[PDB]
Amino acid sequence: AGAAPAGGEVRRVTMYAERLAGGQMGYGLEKGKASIPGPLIELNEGDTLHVEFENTMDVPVSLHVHGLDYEISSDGTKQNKSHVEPGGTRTYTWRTHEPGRRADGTWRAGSAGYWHYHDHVVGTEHGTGGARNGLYGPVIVRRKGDVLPDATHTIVFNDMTINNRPAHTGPNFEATVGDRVEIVMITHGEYYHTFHMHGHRWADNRTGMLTGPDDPSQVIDNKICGPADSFGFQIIAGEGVGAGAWMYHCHVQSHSDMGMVGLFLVKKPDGTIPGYDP
Amino acid sequence: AGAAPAGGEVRRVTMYAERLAGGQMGYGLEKGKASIPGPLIELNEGDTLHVEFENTMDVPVSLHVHGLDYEISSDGTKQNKSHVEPGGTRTYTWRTHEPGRRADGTWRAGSAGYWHYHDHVVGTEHGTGGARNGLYGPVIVRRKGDVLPDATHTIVFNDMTINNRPAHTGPNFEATVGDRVEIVMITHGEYYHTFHMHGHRWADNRTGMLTGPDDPSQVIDNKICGPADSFGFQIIAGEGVGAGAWMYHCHVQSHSDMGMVGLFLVKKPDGTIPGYDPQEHA
Amino acid sequence: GAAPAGGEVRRVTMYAERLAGGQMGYGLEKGKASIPGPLIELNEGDTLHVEFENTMDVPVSLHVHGLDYEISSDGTKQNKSHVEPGGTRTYTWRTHEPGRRADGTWRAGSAGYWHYHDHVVGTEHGTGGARNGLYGPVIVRRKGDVLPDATHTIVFNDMTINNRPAHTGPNFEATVGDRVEIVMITHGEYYHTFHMHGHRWADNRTGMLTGPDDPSQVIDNKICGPADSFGFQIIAGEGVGAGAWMYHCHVQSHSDMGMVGLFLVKKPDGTIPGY
Ligand SMILES: [Cu+2]
Ligand SMILES: [Cu+2]
Ligand SMILES: [Cu+2]
Ligand SMILES: [Cu+2]
Ligand SMILES: [Cu+2]
Ligand SMILES: [Cu+2]
Ligand SMILES: [Cu+2]
Ligand SMILES: [Cu+2]
Ligand SMILES: [Cu+2]
Ligand SMILES: [Cu+2]
Ligand SMILES: [Cu+2]
Ligand SMILES: [Cu+2]
């Protein structure tokens, strides 16, 4: 496929927090276009992102990010006066760095990985109301040379829902056999979960794939996660197994039974999915 | 003793789902011989396994496997009509592959690992009643060169039970100091747990053993696990610690207090276990 | 600095003592018990004989994770190595280096972030003892391991941090650029997720990537359950600057009900802007 380049660009983007239907709340890149989860932010190690944020809502909101470099004034917490009053604006700055050798011979780990942002002030000073309402989104930081996927799908286990959706309503994702598909998997709220995919597996490391025959990372199809965990992987759709409606679900038994299930709909080249009948 | 050879053979096994005493259900390789946990299935990477499956019960049942390759017709779900009606039969096919490089340059991970199979249709569309009743078992897929154990033991944290056994009834496993002992650990149901072993430790990687001095995997004696998690390891029994009645238990405090505990009985060569009074462990 | 090779036989006295408010703790001298207990540090190959005294009116024990101990140092009533009220016992912990065995396999060393705790107070798995505060960290270093400028232990004990009242920390101070080591232990009934604002670490033995070839995930959030232990080292404020950097359990209601603390990273002049 493609390969991520070396980073180092200074980037800008506008972001809004807005109310959505039925007490929900979401982030968006354009007014009236908020979504749960929020827009995918992608950066290359070295990039700087200035987020020109605006709160269109009637209550304070903030933007807090995992993993990336930010100064304390972009913490997005009320305690550090980094929240945004109703109608207010503020520029959050996120920075990223390459790995490299420190002066003392140690190895500084880079920014790359599967990360996320979310509100930190709605409902409580820890964003408990903001997370419930839908104020979360994925951030991917790529290392130079990372393979780029054909498509990227974000799955958020938010309490007992997926992406704040009604029970038993997916979401479903479509691919064709051989597609390189990237899953970003984020958890929020109160519960632990176990994320599981039928017919596909991945390595429990940074990229979700073994670096080669010297990489001892476990290969899994079932992963325990809890509030604010994030991980990701790339799989080849239908590799070794073929086309079909491949279930993904939380494997906590009452959780799948109550509707934390969706489908990885993998099609043959002719567009068919053998045996699928919803 | 020994090492795993290269896979590539086409293997076949018969499997039966059967009701067992106490309202339980289990899988077995021979009729009337079901067990909880189900029979240990071991394959070498590259092997194919045809499972000739018969449901001897009055309710639909299925066979769903983690980790291994299978086409959608062997998914073992009602939704894809790969369940088995009462009294019915079906052949499930599991395949496995060796690691290698893709044309796009990336590494395709092999199937090797500590995996497991279980029912997917008893009680609910996700097998909630089936796993609770005992329809679960272990699958080990070995990579060429993997070290082989002197014995393999399977420990399943199924809800608040170990292997569906009553509280404070084990199971216990015996070995002799120096034995290479393999543990397969699987979790099912509703609850997270933490598996702990006294006197022994393992690496948090595929085999549970470090490859050599360049493996940075954390070495642990306590591992959080949730429903359908599976991992495994090998330990040298008593290595650097000696014989004795070595406890394993869930380390969630109320869980150990309520009976999620067992004993790794490591014997001296003369068959004796120092300091082991069984009634003091009751 | 860097860790030397181990191999020394050490001795130390340890006491179990009642503390205020129904609590209990370990200490190295009488009247100096603390929660969490004293940090025990060893180099792979060291032996530690713990000369243990129970100054309490109820039986107590000492049980350790990860280190090599014979069955007589199990610290369990079940194997009769608990300590009656007023009694004394010597517990012996050993450690070893990694190396190749005869069969050709690689024997894992003792090095890592581990912990000790009681096994007999309240129940025969020490449920009361952990709750009351009988726990503490153990670090076993491999030769050449980087040494930190300071070490702080964070224990998530049920819904508390280090048995502290809700929302009262503990707070830890550092200066921008300090090499700070965290030992993170969990006890009790609940799973948690440990999170630090402004910093990240590697999910491996040392919390540091060995170099460009280590594929471990870099994380700032980690799920942990009872008796899990892990540790890491971070450069305080590296790339982010001074500030009152929050750490907390990320299970939402847990941070709301008290599992929050501050990593107070100062400028070289000792000030924290905006705090
Ligand atoms: Cu769940
Ligand atoms: Cu499955
Ligand atoms: Cu967060
Ligand atoms: Cu499933
Ligand atoms: Cu448990
Ligand atoms: Cu222990
Ligand atoms: Cu499953
Ligand atoms: Cu124990
Ligand atoms: Cu918590
Ligand atoms: Cu954060
Ligand atoms: Cu936070
Ligand atoms: Cu313990």
Author numbering:
A (entry chain B): 40 to 317
B (entry chain A): 40 to 321
C (entry chain C): 41 to 315
Please quote the paper that reports this structure:
Laccases (benzenediol:oxygen oxidoreductases) are copper-containing enzymes that catalyze the oxidation of diverse compounds by molecular oxygen. The active center of laccases contains four copper ions: A blue (Cu1) mononuclear copper center (T1) and a trinuclear copper cluster (T2/T3); the latter consists of the mononuclear T2 copper ion (Cu2) and two T3 copper ions (Cu3α and Cu3β). T1 acts as a center for the reception of electrons from the reducing substrate, while the TNC serves as a binding site for the molecular oxygen and its reduction to water. Three-domain (3D) laccases are monomers consisting of three cupredoxin-type domains. two-domain (2D) laccases consist of two domains and exist as homotrimer, with the T2/T3 located at the interface of domain 2 and domain 1 of neighboring molecules, and T1 located near the surface of domain 2.
To assess the accessibility of TNC, we constructed and purified mutant variants of SgfSL by replacing the amino acids, His165 or Ile170, to either Phe or Ala. Replacing Ile170 to alanine and phenylalanine result in a strong decrease in catalytic activity by an order of magnitude. The expansion of the proposed T3α tunnel upon replacing isoleucine to alanine did not increase enzymatic activity. Apparently, the role of Ile170 is not related to modulating dioxygen access to the TNC through this tunnel. We assumed that Ile170 is rather indirectly involved in the coordination of Cu3α ion within the TNC. Indeed, the detailed comparative analysis of the structures of the wild type SgfSL and its two mutant forms showed that Ile170 can affect (via hydrophobic interactions) the position and mobility of the His157, belonging to the 1st coordination sphere of the Cu3α. In case of Ile170Ala substitution, Ala is unable to establish nonpolar interactions through its side chain and hence it does not interact with His157, which may cause excessive mobility of imidazole ring of His157. In case of the Ile170Phe replacement, the imidazole ring of His157 can be more strongly fixed than it is required for the enzyme functioning. Both replacements of Ile170, inhibit the reduction of oxygen to water, within the TNC and catalytic activity of SgfSL is decreased.
